[PDB]
């Protein structure tokens, strides 16, 4: 159904700025809820931050909540995550993710359709 | 008939919908009703 | 077969004004007959026409003093039900669970002076242009207002107009915003003889066309 | 044919001035009540919002069309989809009566919530553009059709029913930049 | 017992644009009377007929200057609502949101010089069928056309036939694909004297059969 | 009667389905109507 | 209250041959007219009657050709609208799709020699009841049969009967079972005069009384 | 008329349950009933 | 949707008393239940006590029975955890919580909406 394409990772050392963004393949009118998870190196994959897309509704991780900004296109249908004042423990592989299905604020980090392939993102001290 | 919007007659009898009233005068309409209006004494206009 | 239906999404719901009815679980019950009971009202707008009821001016008096002075300004409030000197009121009691009103407010204005005590006075009503209120008769006698003196009827009824730009008015002042939407009523007080400390009662009530519009629910619960 | 056009008279010159014919047109799916009758959406929504018709896109089927004129009158039918319930306030109540379930409050089903709302502006009529303030770019305070409550609202609806439309007003097209005409790609069966 | 029904599959959902209503939650509410409001329109076609605008040429003035050289084309653009010289005009504007169109179009000339300056002034309908417009008028007379020159009436309306093999025609170009799918107009200039600076206006409205056919929204939002 | 295909008729009453309204005319129909059409002068078919 | 219903179970799911309808979601739109179109069918089997297509002889040719030998047996072929011959027929195509059926087929024989050219043929109808079909005419001459020679008129239409014990027949043979259920038919060549090349052209098509019954869907997909 | 089996009356006008046709001839079945029968020549039964 | 404000942490030592509280953002006419849960330190988050809006129905953890205390103001639309005789292993971190979605009392401590950022209470020996 529906591909997301993501952009934006490479490496970069601790104090700098990143930022990342995806765009879905079909712009279908839905309410879909644009969200990036990461996985640390040897550990599980986590929630970090969401976005609606009709309201500019955010969601966030207690780790990233001063340091991270998430935010949306609506002409242009994409999404970015602007990573601020990279920690050395900020190095993971980041995902984004879709949630077509339902769009409420209180389920809004639980539950994902569409993935599409990570990016890395590997700072250094 | 206070906040009824269905043309269609109830589906239950009225013996069961509600109680009945049996019997063996709106005070307040007759009194605004018999207010004065007008004047008093004569009128110059 | 049987007959197919279409079970409709988004219809429904329980909403809490919605105009059907329950279903019955206990039948042919039969009341104590109350015929010709007293003191039945049908409409709040009936009560609010036949019983007016006080306003309340300084100090939370229902009536106005004459003065010992320069000054011809007895009291002067908003034309809103929810103004300082109608906060009392029964019509201000009802209009707060509305969100419109259009027509006729009616105030009367009861003389409780002594026989040997006389006095002229005069209401007139400022509708909105201007930023202040006139504060001499002579002034405001380009208003629409009213004259009466004192005598054997001690009563005066004076009829508020509605006069506005939209068909309804809100029953609610939104914000601190200044300048009420309607005008202002000022009572005056022409000239007086022997008149130190009588008073004049005020009370208001509704008037032939008043109406009240849409049902809400806005105090804090 | 030929007119004084400085006076700016309708003309209608027909395929019979040269020998053609007129043919029957049927003009139903150009009725203003038609074609405003649809849902469209509302992409800005609160835990509070006032349904304000104002705030449909631009460039959208119906709020197109609803730019595209001074003055309307129309009722309403919203599709909210929410949590908890769903208070309903008219035009002219406080912001605080949206908390309290004397009004209508709607106990929320499964997929979203279906009414239809009444017209309750003051007005006889209300307009997309206004030529001053109403106080003692942005049009009066009671230019609005009510407010809803939730503890989220996830997207919101609207249709217009009666819809009647005054006193027309420009409406464009896309613009063409270089082009002999504007080309977009249009739907055609794979292979 | 009761009656029993089956709650088919398929049906029940929200479409968009379905023909059913939804169930009220406020009665008895009463509008202010707007008998006889000024203005209204029930159809976008009758204002597009009686309301003609203007076209947009090269540097994008609504008018065609007579040229002081040997060419005799003042302008020429597709029959095509998406075209680059009716992107600013409200037939285009309430066209963009409809699938298919049929009918006549209305073209509109009004002559802008002066007294003492002459013209004669030539449009012809090309339909589909040849590569390249022609670009004189002695080439262009073998189609449908029409001939004026300049007087008293300043105007001049000329009326595009529908001709094609379909009974519809789409308002929407498909692709970079070439030679438009109905013809061309071309404007020529016959003649003049001594108006060498003066211009002629073009704007178009809609004809007497004209009819837009399936609703869409087509914009990206 | 715009976008509405049911033949049968309402459940809820006119009172509570949409407001009333009250009284105390297109304007481009007419003026579509009124359009001038033919020809002007003489004409030699 | 309001009406209670039973949502019955069993009813409700979709089957995608069912009577009933679903509901609209675009209204109001008119179709280009298709007055008096040329060449509409209504039913499989009017088509099935008025045009007769060829059978499929060996090397998968239309036609049998006369025999210099003492062989007198031209063609046989099985009752069956699945046999070899009748496998590229439109009776055949259309009877693919159904399960039963019941009625008259019909033969179209054309000479297609030349002048100089006579012949003499029959066709005999052998109902089942034999292990082997015969292969003489003498010895098929106790079925129902009919004979015809060459002339003036070129073609020659016999009609198979429908006789058998059930009202209908599948249209389909079971298995590798021998000895189809109906009959055989059999072409033979009484005579001919110096006719060594000439052949004989067979067609088929439905007769007065055919008939298609129960409608499915049995090829791989 | 082919493949609905129900005898009610639709719920929907017929302008939204499908097109309307308009106006400005079966061959097959002509040309089928029109088909000779008989014989040619004469009959000796 | 709704936000929860929370106040009064802070640290004392053992013996004291704390009062917490917790005001949601918006004033819905729901019947949510406000909630506290902590989360010790290298613990995981444990629920402490519940109370209903409509009535005082109040749950409890066996750990805080007699000692904590939860209330309402139904004018204010607050609710305050009032913290008694504290043991100094009630050092966590105190969140509180909304379950909007279901009142009833069976399930009054298994499945809250909005969480709120938690307070910090660190009770001393």
């Known amino acids: 159904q529906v591909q997301l394409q993501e952009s934006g990772g490479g490496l970069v050392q601790a104090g700098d700025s990143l930022r990342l963004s995806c765009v879905p393949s079909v712009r279908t009118s839905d309410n879909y809820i644009m969200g990036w998870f990461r996985q640390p190196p040897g550990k599980e994959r986590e929630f970090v931050a969401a976005?609606?897309?009709?309201?500019?509704?955010?969601k966030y991780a207690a780790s990233v909540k001063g340091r991270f900004a998430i935010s949306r296109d609506v002409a242009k249908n994409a999404a970015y995550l602007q990573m601020n004042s990279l920690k050395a423990e900020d190095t993971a592989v980041y995902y984004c993710?879709?949630?077509?299905?339902?769009?409420?604020?209180?389920?809004?980090?639980?539950?994902?359709?569409?993935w599409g392939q990570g990016t890395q993102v590997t700072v250094s001290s | 008939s206070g906040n009824t919007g269905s043309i269609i007659n109830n589906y239950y009898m009225q013996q069961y919908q509600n109680s009945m009233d049996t019997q063996l005068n709106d005070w307040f309409s007759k009194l605004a009703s018999s207010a004065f209006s007008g004047l008093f004494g004569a009128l110059l206009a | 077969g049987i007959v197919p239906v279409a079970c409709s999404d988004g219809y429904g719901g329980l909403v809490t004004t919605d105009p059907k009815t329950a279903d019955p679980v206990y039948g042919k019950v039969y009341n104590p007959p109350r015929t010709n009971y007293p003191g039945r009202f049908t409409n709040l707008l009936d009560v609010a026409e036949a019983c007016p009821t006080f306003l309340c001016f300084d100090d939370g008096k229902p009536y106005v003093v004459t003065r010992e002075d320069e000054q011809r300004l007895l009291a002067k409030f908003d034309v809103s039900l929810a103004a300082k000197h109608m906060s009392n009121t029964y019509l201000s009691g009802i209009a707060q669970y509305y969100a419109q009103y259009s027509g006729t407010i009616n105030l009367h204005f009861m003389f409780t002076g002594s026989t040997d005590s006389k006095a002229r006075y005069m209401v007139a009503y400022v509708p909105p242009g201007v930023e202040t209120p006139p504060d001499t008769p002579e002034r405001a006698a380009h208003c629409i207002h009213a004259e009466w003196d004192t005598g054997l009827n001690s009563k005066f009824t004076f009829s508020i107009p509605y006069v506005s730009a939209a068909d309804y008015a809100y029953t609610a002042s939104d914000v601190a915003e200044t300048t009420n939407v309607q005008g202002w009523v000022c009572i005056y007080q022409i000239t007086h003889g022997k008149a130190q400390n009588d008073t004049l009662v005020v009370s208001v009530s509704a008037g032939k066309d008043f109406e009240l519009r849409l049902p809400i629910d806005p105090r804090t619960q | 044919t030929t007119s004084a056009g400085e006076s700016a008279d309708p003309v209608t010159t027909t395929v019979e001035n040269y020998g053609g014919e007129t043919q029957v047109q049927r003009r139903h799916h150009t009725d203003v009540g038609f074609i405003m009758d649809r849902f469209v959406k509302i992409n800005n929504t609160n835990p509070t919002h006032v349904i304000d018709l104002m705030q449909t896109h631009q460039h959208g089927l119906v709020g197109a069309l609803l730019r595209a004129a001074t003055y309307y009158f129309s009722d309403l039918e919203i599709v909210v989809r929410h949590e908890g319930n769903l208070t309903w306030v008219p035009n002219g109540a406080p912001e605080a009566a949206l908390s309290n379930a004397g009004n209508p409050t709607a106990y929320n089903k499964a997929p979203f919530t279906r009414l239809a709302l009444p017209y309750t502006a003051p007005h006889r009529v209300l307009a997309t553009v206004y030529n001053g303030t109403s106080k003692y770019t942005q049009l009066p305070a009671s230019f609005n059709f009510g407010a809803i409550r939730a503890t989220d609202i996830s997207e919101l609806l609207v249709r217009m029913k009666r819809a009647e439309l005054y006193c027309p007003r420009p409406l464009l097209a896309v613009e063409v930049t270089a082009q002999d005409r504007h080309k977009q790609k249009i739907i055609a069966p794979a292979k | 017992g009761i009656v029993p029904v089956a709650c088919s599959d398929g049906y029940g959902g929200l479409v968009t644009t379905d023909p059913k209503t939804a169930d009220p939650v406020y009665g008895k509410v009463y509008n202010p009377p707007r008998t006889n409001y000024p203005g209204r329109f029930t159809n976008l076609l009758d204002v597009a007929e009686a309301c003609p605008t203007f076209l947009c040429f090269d540097d994008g003035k609504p008018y065609v200057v007579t040229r002081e050289d040997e060419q005799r084309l003042l302008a020429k653009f597709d029959v095509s609502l998406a075209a680059k010289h009716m992107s600013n005009t409200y037939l285009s504007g309430i066209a963009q949101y409809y699938a298919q169109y049929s009918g006549t179009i209305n073209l509109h000339f009004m002559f802008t010089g002066s007294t003492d300056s002459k013209a004669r002034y030539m449009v012809a309908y090309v339909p589909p069928g040849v590569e390249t417009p022609p670009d004189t008028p002695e080439r262009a007379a073998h189609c449908i056309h029409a001939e004026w020159d300049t007087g008293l009436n300043s105007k001049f309306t000329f009326s595009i036939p529908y001709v094609s093999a379909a009974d519809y025609a789409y308002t929407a170009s498909d692709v970079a694909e070439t030679t438009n799918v109905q013809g061309w107009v071309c404007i020529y200039q016959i003649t003049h004297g001594k108006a060498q600076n003066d211009t002629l206006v073009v704007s178009v409205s809609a004809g007497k059969d004209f009819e837009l056919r399936l609703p869409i929204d087509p914009r990206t939002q | 009667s715009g976008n509405t295909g049911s033949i049968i008729n309402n459940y809820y009453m006119q009172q509570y389905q949409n407001s009333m309204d009250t009284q105390l005319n297109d304007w481009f129909s007419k003026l579509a109507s009124s359009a001038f059409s033919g020809l002007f002068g003489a004409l030699l078919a | 209250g309001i009406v209670p219903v039973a949502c019955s179970d069993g009813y409700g799911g979709l089957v995608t041959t069912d009577p009933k309808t679903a509901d609209p979601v675009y209204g109001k739109v008119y179709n280009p007219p298709r007055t008096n179109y040329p060449g509409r069918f209504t039913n499989l089997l009017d088509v099935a009657e008025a045009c007769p297509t060829f059978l499929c002889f060996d090397d998968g040719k239309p036609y049998v050709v006369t025999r210099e030998d003492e062989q007198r047996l031209l063609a046989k072929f099985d009752v069956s609208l699945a046999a070899k011959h009748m496998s590229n027929t439109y009776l055949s195509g259309i009877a693919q799709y159904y399960a039963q059926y019941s009625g008259t087929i019909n033969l179209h024989f054309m000479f297609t020699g030349s002048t100089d050219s006579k012949a003499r043929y029959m066709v005999a109808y052998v109902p089942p009841g034999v292990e082997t079909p015969p292969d003489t005419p003498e010895r098929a001459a106790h079925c129902i049969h009919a004979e015809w020679d060459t002339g003036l008129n070129s073609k020659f239409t016999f009609s198979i009967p429908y006789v058998s014990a059930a009202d209908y027949a599948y249209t389909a043979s079971d298995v590798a079972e021998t000895t189809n259920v109906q009959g055989w038919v059999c072409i033979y060549q009484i005579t001919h005069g110096k006719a060594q090349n000439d052949t004989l052209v067979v067609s088929v098509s439905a007769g007065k009384d055919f008939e298609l019954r129960l409608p499915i869907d049995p090829r791989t997909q | 008329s082919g493949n609905t089996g129900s005898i009610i009356n639709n719920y929907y006008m017929q302008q939204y349950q499908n097109s309307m046709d308009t106006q400005l001839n079966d061959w097959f079945s002509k040309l089928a009933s029109s088909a000779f029968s008989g014989l040619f020549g004469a009959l000796l039964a | 949707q709704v936000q929860l404000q929370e106040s009064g942490g802070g640290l004392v030592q053992a013996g004291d008393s704390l009062r917490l509280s917790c005001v949601p953002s918006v004033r819905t006419s729901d019947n949510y239940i406000m909630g506290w849960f902590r989360q010790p330190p290298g613990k995981e988050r444990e629920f402490?006590?519940?109370?209903?809006?409509?009535?005082?129905?109040?749950?409890?953890?066996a750990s805080v029975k007699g000692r904590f205390a939860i209330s309402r103001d139904v004018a204010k639309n607050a609710a305050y955890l009032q913290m008694n005789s504290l043991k100094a292993e009630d050092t966590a971190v105190?969140?509180?919580?909304?379950?909007?979605?279901?009142?009833?009392?069976?399930?009054?401590?298994?499945?809250?909406?909005?969480?709120?950022?938690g307070t910090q209470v660190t009770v001393s020996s």
């Open positions: 976005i609606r897309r009709s309201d500019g509704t955010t």
């Open positions: 993710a879709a949630k077509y299905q339902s769009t409420f604020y209180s389920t809004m980090d639980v539950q994902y359709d569409y």
